[PDB]
């Protein structure tokens, strides 16, 4: 299934993005993964149409209180990619 | 152009931007008895508002939709003899 | 199931919008609702990939012949709604 | 069969549009449907060539005494649309 | 170009504007005995005034009619050996 | 059945107009009528989708080689006419 | 067979056009047909190549002494058209 | 466009410069049962990120990749009846 | 391009102006034994002076003749193994 | 593009100027077992230096050679399953 | 039968003209006749549709490489001539 | 086997790069390694024709949505590495 | 076989052209044919590649001492044309 | 048989020139000969239609990556040579 | 197999190019071949992907201390060409 990512500076902007994403569509939250320098990333997973809608809403809520560094939807990830996220 | 009949539609979410906000119909070429053929289906960007079961006039590459294959006419009568 | 809305000024632009919506994907049309001041609203419902495709097509068709005031897709509507 | 719509401000301009339409082609008048603010809409129904001709004549007569807001011909309406009009 | 024979016409009312005021002929490709083939019919925008039963010379995409497939010549003699 | 008229200055432009009309759709041509001052009128009759298509085509062809004064389609002509 | 038409002001320019046409190709003269205002029209009939050639010479001779209003060659007239001329 | 299914890829080292930094997928046209056909494979420059086994919408010559045959949409639903 | 053999010519009097003063040859595509095929004939605007029985190299749409299909080379030797 | 195999060459002396100083290869389309087909040969203007027996990637009309069909890539590996 | 003439300055331009004439249609070439001052004339004869096509082609080819002084088609030549 | 590296600012741009790499050829993905300051690196390994094609594809995709800091292919890596 | 023609003013420039042509390729000289005004024409005959090469050298030698009016190679003459030359 | 020569500055430009020559037609390559000052010459031999095509192709390829000093085709070489 | 060529002024820049090439990919060195004027040429041979990579590194090392005159990769040389090199 599709894969949606949001990357923010700081953890607070990422919990607001992850909360909005999970409310605004039927998606599953995989988890957070930070890489230092304050960059934190949220990963949701679901059907392409749902995941698309979720990422649009999640970026809109997070950008409102903090900084959204980047967002991206992968409509069909390679099977190798589902060993780096999970 | 070719005479064809609309036989379905295609729902595509992940697609380019030249195709945003348009219909995508399955278009089957029909033979000299006004009957669809086998293995003769293309996908056409609707342009005049055609729906299922309608006999349309599908045009090839360039119709400013830019070179997408689009439908350009809905056919009323086909006089043939 | 998802829920899509288009709001137009005048009834004619709303029937063109609802015709494009119903041809673009497999959505069932719920009905119209006018609130006065010339604002009419059409509401469809279906899967979120279909509803997203329908609302985008309906907005472009109604935009051509009238004024589109607002549009919106609600992916997971609350049960109170 | 096809479907033709004219929309005017006020009822008088719409009775002149509906009268001109029924005279100028072999169409059937379905009825009027107003939505407040003075917008009234006439709906005719017939073959595409007839309905086309009717709407051209009806707008020409109605524009002469009042305001024609919009006109439109749907050559083949969806079956769902024939539950909102009728 | 291809050798073809006019075998009918098409009456279309709801169509684009690039096609207003032009004929639409059914054009059947004919084989090496000057005899029409099966399932080889296109729709061509007449350009020189061809009618039924006439052997014409139908050209592909670009003839400024703009990329409609049009007829560009009426054929008098086909010497072939 | 419907009724279409083209009015041209001079007889030559009227025979080009009537030739384009009769090839464009399945209409029967009624006949010419000149009223003096060089004005000649051609009159066809048939179904309203055919008669429409014919008059649009005849106007563009006669416009090319002469002066077209007026054109008109009468969808439902009165029985007194 | 094809059909060639020349239209002139006055009868003298049309007898010169009709004489030149019949000399310069193997065509058959159908007749004259005037419509008042001094417009007279000549109609020849024959194969397309002959009729083409005739009409070119006929206009060149007629234009020399009078006014040629219009000229035209129909390569394949509809059968209905061969009841208005003849 | 045509409905097709990605069935492989091509690795080419010595190639032109208009193709640097792009995928090259094998694209098999599939019939009216959503099943690949025989001897119907083209090479398409991926443009939206399609992989193996995915049903895509391959477009002909001109897609600015410039006239390379590219993939322009990944298809979710094909409603056909 | 394709390998083809000139097998005739076409005489057309009533035609467009983009084709005035040019030859129109019948061009038959020949198979891998240098032998003409069946139902594979096009009409090509000669450009280098080819005549009957000559093996030529016919090019598709665009050769500035403007998109007429023209002949662009007369072939001396076809080495094939 | 299409997968094809170089199977020969063509020597043409009398030809246009857009083709001066270029190779002309016979290009046979090969099927899903990497085996040449029958009656599927085109002539392609080499562009990257391909020779006999090499599997290449032949592109259609427009490659600035200007719309000659040229070869644009030499293929190393064709992974297909 | 009809009769066509081309007059050129110099003999070379006249053989190019007569080669294009004899390939363009089914006409028999009568022969050359020079009258001095460098003027050479080629004369063909055949049906008037063929002779018209040949002279138009011969004029354009000789114009390319020399000076064409005059050309003429005589559709019905007198028996004294 | 060869070894390819892409270094990007931020993790999202690195998963897009690694997705394009893994679809472009037959390479196995080793894993990520972030060294602080927001620099994340993806590492693939495979044959040198595949690894060269993957790294060029991954660079262009990540460049589209983020910052690519550095890229590199190591054809014969030392055994100590 | 192909056919090559060179046309010069005067006979001396044409004997130099005909000599250079016969030396520089495997062609056969058909003959000279003058038409007054000093125009003389040489005609060679052979395979297309040879005849092409010959005409290039023949024009280069003749232009050096006199005036070359025109040159031309016909890759495949019509059979009728091989009754005007020979 | 005919004889073709290309002279280039440097050896690399001469192996590119020779490679293009040997692929363009059916000529046998004789060998290189350098005379000092960086001038290297390649010599092929074959029929005059093939050698003319090879030398024109080799000149354009070597011109792309180096300096071509001179080229020449000798159609009938003397036996002393 | 493919063929890679580097050409330099002087022998020292060509031993540095040949050393860098053999280190940076799995290629085989065929030999040197000088033609006077100080031009020396190195020839490597291997798979297309390897030979490509080698020539890029070899030109980068040689250009650093001397002059690289030209470089070139032939992906598939004609069989005749493998009698001039070897």
Residue numbers in the entry:
A (entry chain AP), D (entry chain EP), G (entry chain DV), M (entry chain HR), O (entry chain AL): 3 to 88
B (entry chain AM), E (entry chain EM), H (entry chain AI), I (entry chain DS), J (entry chain HO): 1 to 65, 69 to 84
C (entry chain AO), F (entry chain EO), K (entry chain DU), L (entry chain AK), N (entry chain HQ): 3 to 83
Quote the study that presented this structure, word for word.
Bacterial microcompartments (BMCs) are organelle-like structures consisting of a large quasi-icosahedral or polyhedral protein shell up to 200–300 nm in size and an encapsulated enzymatic core. The GRM2 locus therefore contains five structural shell genes encoding four BMC-H proteins and one BMC-P protein. In this study, we demonstrate a practical production system for recombinant GRM2 shell particles from Klebsiella pneumoniae and the requirements for recombinant shell formation.
We calculated a near-atomic (3.3 Å) resolution map for the icosahedral particles and built an atomic model. The particles had a pT = 4 quasi-symmetry with 12 cmcD pentamers occupying the vertices of the icosahedron and 180 BMC-H monomers that were arranged in 30 hexamers within the facets. The map is not of sufficiently high resolution to distinguish between these three types of proteins, so we chose to model cmcC′ in the model, since the mass spectrometry data identified it as the most abundant BMC-H protein in cmcABC′ + D small type particles. The resulting pT = 4 BDP particles are 250 Å in diameter. The pore in the center of the cmcD pentamer has a funnel shape and is approximately 16 Å wide on the outer surface but is only approximately 4 Å in diameter on the inner surface as judged by the Van der Waals diameters of atoms forming it.
